[PDB]
Design a protein around this nucleic acid. Structure first.
Ligand SMILES: [Mg+2]
Ligand SMILES: [Mg+2]
Ligand SMILES: [Mg+2]
Ligand SMILES: [Mg+2]
Ligand SMILES: [Mg+2]
Ligand SMILES: [Mg+2]
Ligand SMILES: [Mg+2]
Ligand SMILES: [Mg+2]
Ligand SMILES: [Mg+2]
Ligand SMILES: [Mg+2]
Ligand SMILES: [Mg+2]
Ligand SMILES: [Mg+2]
Ligand SMILES: [Mg+2]
Ligand SMILES: [Mg+2]
Ligand SMILES: [Mg+2]
Ligand SMILES: [Mg+2]
Ligand SMILES: [Mg+2]
Ligand SMILES: [Mg+2]
Ligand SMILES: [Mg+2]
Ligand SMILES: [Mg+2]
Ligand SMILES: [Mg+2]
Ligand SMILES: [Mg+2]
Ligand SMILES: [Mg+2]
Ligand SMILES: [Mg+2]
Ligand SMILES: [Mg+2]
Ligand SMILES: [Mg+2]
Ligand SMILES: [Mg+2]
Ligand SMILES: [Mg+2]
Ligand SMILES: [Mg+2]
Ligand SMILES: [Mg+2]
Ligand SMILES: [Mg+2]
Ligand SMILES: [Mg+2]
Ligand SMILES: [Mg+2]
Ligand SMILES: [Mg+2]
Ligand SMILES: [Mg+2]
Ligand SMILES: [Mg+2]
Ligand SMILES: [Mg+2]
Ligand SMILES: [Zn+2]
Lengths: 23, 192, 37, 176, 136, 126, 133
RNA sequence: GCCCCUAAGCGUGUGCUAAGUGGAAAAGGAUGUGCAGUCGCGAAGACAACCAGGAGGUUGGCUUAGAAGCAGCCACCCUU
RNA sequence: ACCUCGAUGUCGGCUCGUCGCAUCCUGGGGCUGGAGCAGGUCCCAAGGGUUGGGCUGUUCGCCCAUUAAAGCGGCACGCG
């Protein structure tokens, strides 16, 4: 589940503000 | 047995609210309110550290001498709103009191001494209500256990109550019950 | 020598240290030697 | 801390040399050199001592204080009295002899083994069971002693091998 | 196991698991207790294991109060089945726990043994808890 | 440990000295518990046997003119004391001193005056 | 420096005194001939002892203790007692016979009076789990 | 967002981190380190290291061969 | 039910490989209720090696004779 975790966590960047499409 | 009032400082809360209370609580201060027959609910910030220190030294039930901007008042802790988790005191209630004034209060009861070994002593009511003067309030009173016979109950009416204090609770409120220590084949037989 | 996530002083002759970045418990008893991993 | 707080005695026959943070000690047994840590300070107390002092109580200097103190003490004692280790053998047929300046062990291997004493270290057997290792350096004597000690597996059953002098091996007995 | 004798409705929604425990946050029956710090579903399996753990550790005489009851049923639809065809049949029981609620309470003479039995119980629970004493 | 028992024991030793005339002081380290049993068999029938901290009784040695034994705190002290005539305990100190030769007579305190280790046999025979 | 206790009707048994001495370089039957003199004074008492056998086979045994339950047998005639104390107050021992028995009980003690010895008798009996009367 | 790629700060002041943590994760383990809060003793000399001991009643009574203090029960006794 | 139904050929075997290590053998160890011989368990280690048959469509599996050993897996359950 590395791909899912690592895609899902890049929403927590400063430029995304804790949100991103498809979580 | 007069108890010397404890001397805190307090100052009138400029403006009220949850934001103001949170800020004051953040600066190491406790929001509180004076009331009583002083007929003026007066909103007072007081030092959190000193409040906790005096509550440690003299329990929940202790007279204070509040210095409100120079005016000198006698107060008694009525209630403390405390957080369930962070355990910090959030709010305090202060009845105004003066000498020679009976007041109803709740005093903790701490069982003292060792019991007879074959059985365990267990308290159901840790607090007993008493009527007593402002200065003569006992912060705690003891109940005797010294090698009781087989399991028996104890109620508020047979306690060595202090002088100048009066029981309020109905005398048949159980406080400490000696119950026989569960055997090996009795302890794990309850709970499912 | 155990290699487990949790290391504890099994007996009172054991003692816990940090050696080379690892928490270890070291005793005079060879059986109690034990480190984190 | 407290150990790093007292100065090191220097005897009336042993002369010291300080340059920069480097120093050397010279005595009857030989000579030695040593380097002292950076934040620590080393001073020649002319009243007969070498004072090691930490400027502050930060954990690094708090740590290097006693370290440097013990290094200087070991340097001086090694140059004055030297460092010697007594070490014994146990078992039947486990024997020790000499060959030149080297010391030879016959401990039940199908071949003999023998150790060449490196620089500043002199082996000296006093009995086929008892031998000693001596040197000007405390660390070298201990290291070569440990190297000797581990020429056999530990023996908790019969104890046979190379033990230290004052060492009490642990021993568990198999049921047969 | 702790099972209610009957519930009026046997298929409820999942208990809302937010907020701080408002009711039941004090130690009242015994002198030492285990007091929670995280939201969870404490099933009767966890409760039974923890109670047996405390009883095994103290093993002599002392009162254990399980002042939480598992009376809320979580259902589970049978395996290998697709979505749909209605809600499943209830097959485990739960207490809804908030951060703040005293879960287990103990009365025992000494201190260290009581603390150790309480932490032995804590290890069997799906949450972080702490040992809390009868006094402020 | 607090100042309370410090002071109470200071008073204890000071007051037990007051009513005793036989005062021979000694250093004893190195004799077994059963050996002290033998000594209190042979001496406890007349005396009491105590020890004092080399510091706590520095000021406990000031109420009388017992200021003269502060300078003999070199070696953990201990005293056997008889309340009667001074002549009793001096024999038993030698009786319990000969059997090891490792119990030293730290000195004496006679007529309320402090004396070295040499002059205990000077007065003990007399 | 050791101690032993021997029953008055046993013949060098292996359970109680098997490893009692063999590791200390002590004899057996010669120790029997030594310790029978002191065991057989009373003819009706099992005897304990403080044993001190020197490294070179010179046993120097001296009495230490009297037996406790076995002499309560002779004190009351009671056969034995229930192993669980503090509920059966079915045992009674008096003080005047203690004054009788002190002069054979005070022989090896370290007090300066009789209060201490009479009181340690009382304390031993109270430690058995009963009172003294 | 501002060392170079790559536009703009190897910005200033005070602190923290030694893990390349920053630049993934749980129950749980842990003398890492900084700060704050109380508590026990402590120059009448305490914690460590160093020595003399650690006794008399007295191997307390339980099923067994010995429970003696070190399987498993009953709990917390005097003399120096 | 997210791409593919104006076509992404579907099991096993063959040929040929390639990578991981969660190690089957060989190599280095710590603890043992490890005397030795031989083991048990954990740790480190991926360089090379890792058989031929009977039964069955077989994978799986059962067995036969060996072997230092006859490892487990990913690659469109690799490879038409
Ligand atoms: Mg997963
Ligand atoms: Mg979503
Ligand atoms: Mg474990
Ligand atoms: Mg809702
Ligand atoms: Mg509540
Ligand atoms: Mg409610
Ligand atoms: Mg847990
Ligand atoms: Mg580019
Ligand atoms: Mg640029
Ligand atoms: Mg910037
Ligand atoms: Mg710069
Ligand atoms: Mg910068
Ligand atoms: Mg900076
Ligand atoms: Mg990391
Ligand atoms: Mg990283
Ligand atoms: Mg993490
Ligand atoms: Mg922990
Ligand atoms: Mg920290
Ligand atoms: Mg036993
Ligand atoms: Mg859809
Ligand atoms: Mg498409
Ligand atoms: Mg298609
Ligand atoms: Mg096409
Ligand atoms: Mg095509
Ligand atoms: Mg196409
Ligand atoms: Mg391939
Ligand atoms: Mg590996
Ligand atoms: Mg491998
Ligand atoms: Mg191997
Ligand atoms: Mg191995
Ligand atoms: Mg290579
Ligand atoms: Mg076929
Ligand atoms: Mg493959
Ligand atoms: Mg395929
Ligand atoms: Mg494949
Ligand atoms: Mg194909
Ligand atoms: Mg084809
Ligand atoms: Zn250990």
């Amino acid at each position: 589940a590395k791909r899912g975790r690592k895609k899902r966590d890049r929403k927590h960047s400063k430029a995304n503000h804790g949100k991103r499409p498809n979580a | 047995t007069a108890n010397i009032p404890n001397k805190l400082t307090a100052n009138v809360r400029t403006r009220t609210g949850k934001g103001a209370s949170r800020q004051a609580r953040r600066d190491g201060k406790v929001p509180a309110v004076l009331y009583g027959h002083g007929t003026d609910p007066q909103h007072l910030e007081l030092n959190a550290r000193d409040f906790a220190a005096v509550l440690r030294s003299h329990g929940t039930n202790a007279i204070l001498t509040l210095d409100i901007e120079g005016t000198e008042q006698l107060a008694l802790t009525k209630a403390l709103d405390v957080h369930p988790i962070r355990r910090n005191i959030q709010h305090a209630d202060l009845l105004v009191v003066q000498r020679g004034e009976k007041v109803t209060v709740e005093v903790t009861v701490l069982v003292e001494g060792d019991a007879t070994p074959g059985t365990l002593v267990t308290q159901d009511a840790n607090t007993i209500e008493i009527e007593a003067e402002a200065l003569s309030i006992p912060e705690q009173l003891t109940v005797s256990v010294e090698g009781v016979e087989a399991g028996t109950q104890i109620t508020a009416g047979q306690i060595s109550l202090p002088e100048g204090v009066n029981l309020i609770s109905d005398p048949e409120l159980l406080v400490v019950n000696v119950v026989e220590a569960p055997s090996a084949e009795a302890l794990e037989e309850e709970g499912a | 020598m155990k290699v487990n996530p949790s290391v504890k002083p099994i007996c009172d002759k054991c003692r816990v240290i940090r050696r080379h970045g690892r928490v270890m418990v070291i005793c005079s008893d060879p059986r109690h030697k034990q480190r984190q991993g | 801390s407290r150990i790093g707080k007292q100065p090191v005695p220097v005897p009336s026959g042993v002369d010291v040399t300080i340059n920069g943070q480097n120093l050397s000690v010279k005595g009857p047994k030989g000579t030695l050199t040593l380097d002292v840590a950076e934040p620590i300070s080393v001073s020649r107390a002319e009243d007969g001592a070498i004072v090691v002092t930490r400027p502050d109580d930060e954990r690094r200097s708090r740590s290097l204080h006693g370290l440097s103190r013990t290094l200087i003490a070991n340097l001086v004692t090694g140059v004055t009295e030297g460092y010697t280790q007594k070490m014994e053998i146990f078992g039947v047929g486990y024997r020790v002899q000499l060959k030149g300046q080297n010391l030879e062990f016959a401990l039940g291997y199908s071949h003999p083994v023998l150790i060449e004493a490196p620089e500043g270290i002199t082996f000296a057997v006093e009995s086929p069971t008892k031998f000693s290792v001596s040197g000007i350096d405390k660390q070298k004597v201990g290291q070569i002693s440990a190297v000797i000690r581990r020429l056999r597996r530990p023996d908790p059953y019969k104890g046979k091998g190379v033990r230290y002098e004052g060492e009490q091996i642990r021993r568990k007995v198999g049921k047969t | 196991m702790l099972i209610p004798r009957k519930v009026k409705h046997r298929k409820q929604h999942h208990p809302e698991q937010r907020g701080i425990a408002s009711g039941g946050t004090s130690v009242s029956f015994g002198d030492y207790g285990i007091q929670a710090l995280e939201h969870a579903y404490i099933t009767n399996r966890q409760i039974e294991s923890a109670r047996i753990a405390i009883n095994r550790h103290i093993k002599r005489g002392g009162k254990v109060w399980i002042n939480i009851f598992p009376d809320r049923p979580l259902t589970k639809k049978p395996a290998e089945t697709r979505m749909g065809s209605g809600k499943g049949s209830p097959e485990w029981w739960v207490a809804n726990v908030k951060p703040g609620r005293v879960l287990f309470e103990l009365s025992y003479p000494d201190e260290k043994t009581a603390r150790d039995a309480l932490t032995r119980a804590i290890h069997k629970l799906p949450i972080k808890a702490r040992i809390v004493t009868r006094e402020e | 440990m607090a100042k309370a028992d410090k002071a109470t024991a200071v008073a204890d030793i000071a007051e037990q000295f007051k009513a005793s005339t036989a005062t021979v002081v000694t250093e004893y380290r190195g004799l077994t518990v059963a050996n002290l049993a033998e000594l209190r068999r042979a001496l406890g029938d007349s005396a009491t046997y105590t020890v004092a901290k080399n510091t706590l009784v520095k000021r406990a040695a000031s109420e009388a003119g017992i200021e003269g034994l502060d300078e003999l705190f070199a070696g953990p002290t201990a005293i056997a004391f008889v309340k009667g005539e001074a002549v009793d305990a001096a024999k038993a100190i030698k009786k319990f001193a000969k059997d090891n030769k490792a119990l030293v007579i730290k000195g004496g305190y006679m007529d309320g005056k402090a004396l070295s280790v040499a002059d205990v046999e000077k007065i003990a025979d007399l | 420096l050791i101690k032993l206790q021997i029953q008055a009707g046993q013949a060098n048994p292996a359970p109680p005194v098997g490893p009692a001495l063999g590791q200390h370089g002590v004899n057996i039957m010669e120790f029997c001939k030594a310790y029978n003199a002191a065991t057989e004074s009373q003819r009706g008492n099992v005897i304990p002892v403080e044993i001190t056998v020197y490294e070179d086979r010179s046993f120097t045994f001296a009495l230490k203790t009297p037996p406790a339950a076995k002499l309560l047998l002779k004190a009351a005639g009671v056969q034995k007692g229930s192993g669980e104390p503090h509920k059966t107050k079915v045992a009674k021992v008096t003080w005047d016979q203690v004054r009788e028995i002190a002069e054979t009980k005070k022989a090896d003690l370290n007090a300066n009076d009789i209060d201490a010895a009479a009181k340690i008798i009382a304390g031993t009996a109270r430690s058995m789990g009963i009172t003294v009367e």
